[PDB]
Amino acid sequence: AEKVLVTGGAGYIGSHTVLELLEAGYLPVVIDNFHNAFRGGGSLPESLRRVQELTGRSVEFEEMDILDQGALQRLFKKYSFMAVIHFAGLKAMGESVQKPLDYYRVNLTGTIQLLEIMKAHGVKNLVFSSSATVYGNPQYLPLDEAHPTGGCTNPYGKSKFFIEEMIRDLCQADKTWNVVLLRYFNPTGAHASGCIGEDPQGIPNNLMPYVSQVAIGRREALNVFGNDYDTEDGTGVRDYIHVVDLAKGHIAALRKLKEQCGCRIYNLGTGTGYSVLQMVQAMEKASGKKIPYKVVARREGDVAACYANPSLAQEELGWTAALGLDRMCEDLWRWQKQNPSGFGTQA
Amino acid sequence: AEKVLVTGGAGYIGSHTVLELLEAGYLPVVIDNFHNAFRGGGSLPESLRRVQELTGRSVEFEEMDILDQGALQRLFKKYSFMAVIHFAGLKAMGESVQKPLDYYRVNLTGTIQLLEIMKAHGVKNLVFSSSATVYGNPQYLPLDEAHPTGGCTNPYGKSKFFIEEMIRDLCQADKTWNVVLLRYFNPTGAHASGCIGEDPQGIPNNLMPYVSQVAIGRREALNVFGNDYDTEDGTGVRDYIHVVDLAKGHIAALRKLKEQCGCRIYNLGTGTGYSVLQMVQAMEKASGKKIPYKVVARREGDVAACYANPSLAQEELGWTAALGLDRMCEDLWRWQKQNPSGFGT
Numbered sequence: 023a024e025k026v027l028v029t030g031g032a033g034y035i036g037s038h039t040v041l042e043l044l045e046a047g048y049l050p051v052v053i054d055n056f057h058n059a060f061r062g063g064g065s066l067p068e069s070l071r072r073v074q075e076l077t078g079r080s081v082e083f084e085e086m087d088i089l090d091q092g093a094l095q096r097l098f099k100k101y102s103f104m105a106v107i108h109f110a111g112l113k114a115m116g117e118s119v120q121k122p123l124d125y126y127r128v129n130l131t132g133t134i135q136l137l138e139i140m141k142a143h144g145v146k147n148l149v150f151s152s153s154a155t156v157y158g159n160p161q162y163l164p165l166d167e168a169h170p171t172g173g174c175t176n177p178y179g180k181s182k183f184f185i186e187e188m189i190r191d192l193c194q195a196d197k198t199w200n201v202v203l204l205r206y207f208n209p210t211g212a213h214a215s216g217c218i219g220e221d222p223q224g225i226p227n228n229l230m231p232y233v234s235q236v237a238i239g240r241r242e243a244l245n246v247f248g249n250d251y252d253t254e255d256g257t258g259v260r261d262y263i264h265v266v267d268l269a270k271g272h273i274a275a276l277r278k279l280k281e282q283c284g285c286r287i288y289n290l291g292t293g294t295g296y297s298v299l300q301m302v303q304a305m306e307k308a309s310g311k312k313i314p315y316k317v318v319a320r321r322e323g324d325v326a327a328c329y330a331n332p333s334l335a336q337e338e339l340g341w342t343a344a345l346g347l348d349r350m351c352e353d354l355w356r357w358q359k360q361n362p363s364g365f366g367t368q369a
Numbered sequence: 370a371e372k373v374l375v376t377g378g379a380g381y382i383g384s385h386t387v388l389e390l391l392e393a394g395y396l397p398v399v400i401d402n403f404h405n406a407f408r409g410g411g412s413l414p415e416s417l418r419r420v421q422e423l424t425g426r427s428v429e430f431e432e433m434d435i436l437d438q439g440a441l442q443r444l445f446k447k448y449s450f451m452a453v454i455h456f457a458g459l460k461a462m463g464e465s466v467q468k469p470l471d472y473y474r475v476n477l478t479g480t481i482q483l484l485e486i487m488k489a490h491g492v493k494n495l496v497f498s499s500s501a502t503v504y505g506n507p508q509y510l511p512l513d514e515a516h517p518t519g520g521c522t523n524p525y526g527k528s529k530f531f532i533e534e535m536i537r538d539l540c541q542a543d544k545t546w547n548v549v550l551l552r553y554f555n556p557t558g559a560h561a562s563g564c565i566g567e568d569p570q571g572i573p574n575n576l577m578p579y580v581s582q583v584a585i586g587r588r589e590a591l592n593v594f595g596n597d598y599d600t601e602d603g604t605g606v607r608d609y610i611h612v613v614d615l616a617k618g619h620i621a622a623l624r625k626l627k628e629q630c631g632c633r634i635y636n637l638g639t640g641t642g643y644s645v646l647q648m649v650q651a652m653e654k655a656s657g658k659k660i661p662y663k664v665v666a667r668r669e670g671d672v673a674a675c676y677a678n679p680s681l682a683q684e685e686l687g688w689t690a691a692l693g694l695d696r697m698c699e700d701l702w703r704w705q706k707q708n709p710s711g712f713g714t
């Protein structure tokens with residue numbers, strides 16, 4: 023009977039998570055300001071309109087910015103939330119380094135405000151979207167939760183780190199709060215229906231969408247950012263994790279909250295690292311198309327290799343990433359093929 | 370632009386700095402929300418009313434909160450600022466650990482709003498009130514700017530480190546910004562006049578005001594937080610710096626901004642550390658009163674010794690603290706004796 027508030031719920035990870043919540047019997051209330059989500063023909067973001075169709079369950083949604091104090095207050099007054107899953111924020115589009123204040127305002131002040139509003143309304147259960155970037159340049163691998171944090175590169179990563187810190191202090195000061203900080207690795211793939219997925223606007227900054235776009239025939243070749251790293255093939259290595267697994271990890275996080283767990287931090291990754299070339303190859307296999315690429319200059323601030331140690335999460339969260347590489351690629355391909363130009367309003 | 374905005378200008382360090390600004394020929398505009406400042410009988414906070422009286426120069430003031438975006442907008446439209454000295458914030462009333470959100474809201478969100486307005490109005494010159502707390506538990510002494518920072522014990526100190534980091538990022542992103550981050554050590558003392566000084570409410574958390582309150586007779590005895598540290602006498606050692614010198618350091622920071630220095634960080638300390646007992650003794654000498662004390666348990670999170678390496682500030686800012694221990698004690702006593710109840714009741 024008590025709701026779960028989902029901020030930034032119309033985005034990539036958020037939409038997939040709303041779907042999992044609905045299927046698991048939860049009742050979400052979703053907010054988003056369309057900063058990086060496509061408007062549908064109706065009131066709902068297209069992503070969520072599709073989630074409603076897929077699940078056969080209604081999606082409760084309000085267009086709203088987490089920076090809008092009054093709206094946020096009214097929302098918390100109107101419903102009785104039992105928890106909040108916070109995805110809303112700015113993510114690097116390689117942008118952060120150039121616009122620190124936007125990241126500090128949206129991510130930092132936006133989250134402080136949300137926490138204040140939560141406290142004031144007696145909602146002290148949170149699931150926070152963190153990231154492997156908080157670990158900075160890996161000092162060792164795989165990255166376990168004990169790996170040093172902070173020392174992050176850009177404003178985006180620092181914003182995530184500062185937020186983690188704040189929540190940690192909050193839990194320390196008030197034993198009644200429960201917060202699960204989830205450090206995601208590299209989310210990829212799409213819901214198996216092929217109806218929703220990652221919907222980038224313009225030239226994708228991330229690997230996977232660029233690859234699929236080449237495979238679909240929109241882009242000519244993949245620009246590989248350096249091949250001189252200290253890795254097996256010289257190309258960057260990352261722990262790619264299926265968005266569906268990631269979304270399910272959120273449900274696990276809600277259950278953890280119910281245990282009155284205090285502050286907990288978990289990596290959400292598969293524990294397996296793949297290089298850029300390995301991802302291209304898997305995409306060629308999924309797509310049944312050759313995927314050309316060209317090696318270009320390294321990208322500023324890029325790390326050589328990053329991958330998780332997912333044992334804490336398996337142990338404490340009762341969660342593991344069930345989907346493999348081919349699944350990720352096949353699911354991404356399905357979304358891409360069925361939606362050559364991403365989301366669009368209904369015909 | 371011409372004017373200098375002084376946030377939290379009605380506070381301890383800020384009011385002394387406003388005085389110095391006025392004496393140096395600057396034109397300040399002060400804002401404060403009275404969160405930790407005493408209101409006078411007029412518009413001005415008592416501290417500033419006094420500064421006005423002492424300098425014979427007017428104090429331009431506006432009561433407002435840094436968290437008020439609308440008020441910030443109006444302020445920046447009304448005046449043409451050339452720089453901003455940012456003192457406004459919450460300090461540990463030992464509190465931080467217990468009220469993180471208040472600290473993060475006022476210190477982080479407030480500073481971010483200020484930086485935004487500054488950016489909006491093209492006022493990209495800032496002097497920020499930082500603290501030696503950012504260094505965390507000292508790895509070596511004295512503390513130079515190169516010592517590691519972050520990994521702060523508390524929400525208050527963390528807030529300070531996060532702010533420095535944000536400012537660093539801002540300066541990186543926009544080379545037109547100039548920012549001087551001043552890491553204060555342990556501010557003490559008062560203006561020579563004895564008319565203004567630190568005005569704590571309730572039982573003071575800091576050593577000096579507690580000491581002065583014992584001497585004046587407001588407190589029975591000083592509780593000494595441990596005598597078993599690895600210090601010459603077993604008690605905590607700190608770099609006590611006269612608030613007047615600190616205020617003067619802000620003027621040196623202003624001149625630094627004019628060089629188009631980008632982001633610079635400096636310690637504001639004397640480089641001389643004194644123990645709790647040494648301070649007690651020096652205050653007995655200054656006040657002519659006895660200051661009884663009792664040794665109690667160590668205070669959670671306390672560091673044995675902390676003091677500055679003042680070289681960089683001397684070399685780069687061209688500033689050094691001139692007033693020593695006796696002077697600090699003499700000035701602190703005068704303020705306390707002459708104002709037994711602080712600014713008012």
Ligand SMILES: NC(=O)c1ccc[n+]([C@@H]2O[C@H](COP(=O)([O-])OP(=O)(O)OC[C@H]3O[C@@H](n4cnc5c(N)ncnc54)[C@H](O)[C@@H]3O)[C@@H](O)[C@H]2O)c1
Pocket residue numbers: 029030031032033034035036053054055056057058059086087088089108109110111112113128132151152153154206207208209
């Ligand atoms: N995708 C990744 O690789 C990745 C990795 C690390 C952590 N994260 C974090 O996880 C979260 C979700 O990432 P994602 O890939 O789904 O990104 P996304 O951009 O698709 O999702 C974020 C959603 O937040 C919304 N939003 C942005 N600012 C808002 C505001 N002020 N008020 C309300 N809504 C606002 C956007 O419109 C968007 O729908 C983000 O916080 C992101 O930083 C993602």
Ligand SMILES: NC(=O)c1ccc[n+]([C@@H]2O[C@H](COP(=O)([O-])OP(=O)(O)OC[C@H]3O[C@@H](n4cnc5c(N)ncnc54)[C@H](O)[C@@H]3O)[C@@H](O)[C@H]2O)c1
Pocket residue numbers: 376377378379380381382383400401402403404405406433434435436455456457458459460475479498499500501553554555556
């Ligand atoms: N005194 C110290 O020992 C010490 C140590 C190092 C750094 N600092 C920092 O130096 C600064 C000044 O310290 P101080 O001793 O003068 O403290 P203070 O409390 O006397 O001065 C702060 C002033 O800011 C005002 N203020 C607080 N919140 C405000 C808000 N939201 N809007 C507007 N005004 C607001 C308060 O009313 C007060 O007058 C603070 O940033 C403090 O954290 C102080």
Ligand SMILES: CC(=O)N[C@H]1[C@@H](OP(=O)(O)OP(=O)(O)OC[C@H]2O[C@@H](n3ccc(=O)[nH]c3=O)[C@H](O)[C@@H]2O)O[C@H](CO)[C@@H](O)[C@@H]1O
Pocket residue numbers: 113114115116153155175208227228229230232245246247248257258259260298321322323324325
């Ligand atoms: C949303 C997000 O948090 N992105 C961050 C994440 O990126 P991260 O590197 O994890 O993820 P990407 O998808 O951008 O890149 C994955 C890998 O593919 C490579 N690649 C990617 C795209 C492309 O067109 N060509 C190519 O060769 C990258 O160099 C990397 O080796 O960590 C990086 C390093 O800390 C940061 O710089 C990014 O801001």
Ligand SMILES: CC(=O)N[C@H]1[C@@H](OP(=O)(O)OP(=O)(O)OC[C@H]2O[C@@H](n3ccc(=O)[nH]c3=O)[C@H](O)[C@@H]2O)O[C@H](CO)[C@@H](O)[C@@H]1O
Pocket residue numbers: 461500502525526555556574575576577579591592593594595604605606607645668670671672
């Ligand atoms: C760990 C820390 O960051 N603490 C704060 C404290 O520093 P800090 O601890 O240095 O300063 P204090 O004035 O509180 O104490 C100075 C010394 O006196 C001792 N003492 C103090 C009071 C008392 O009643 N009895 C006693 O014995 C302390 O143990 C210490 O050794 O004030 C600074 C501003 O002034 C703040 O910037 C700091 O956030």
Ligand SMILES: [Cl-]
Pocket residue numbers: 023024025100101102103
């Ligand atoms: Cl409800």
Ligand SMILES: [Cl-]
Pocket residue numbers: 409410411412413418
């Ligand atoms: Cl007045």
Ligand SMILES: [Cl-]
Pocket residue numbers: 372447448449450
């Ligand atoms: Cl003016």
Ligand SMILES: [Cl-]
Pocket residue numbers: 609610611612614639690691692693
């Ligand atoms: Cl001094």
Ligand SMILES: [Mg+2]
Pocket residue numbers: 332333334
């Ligand atoms: Mg393990």
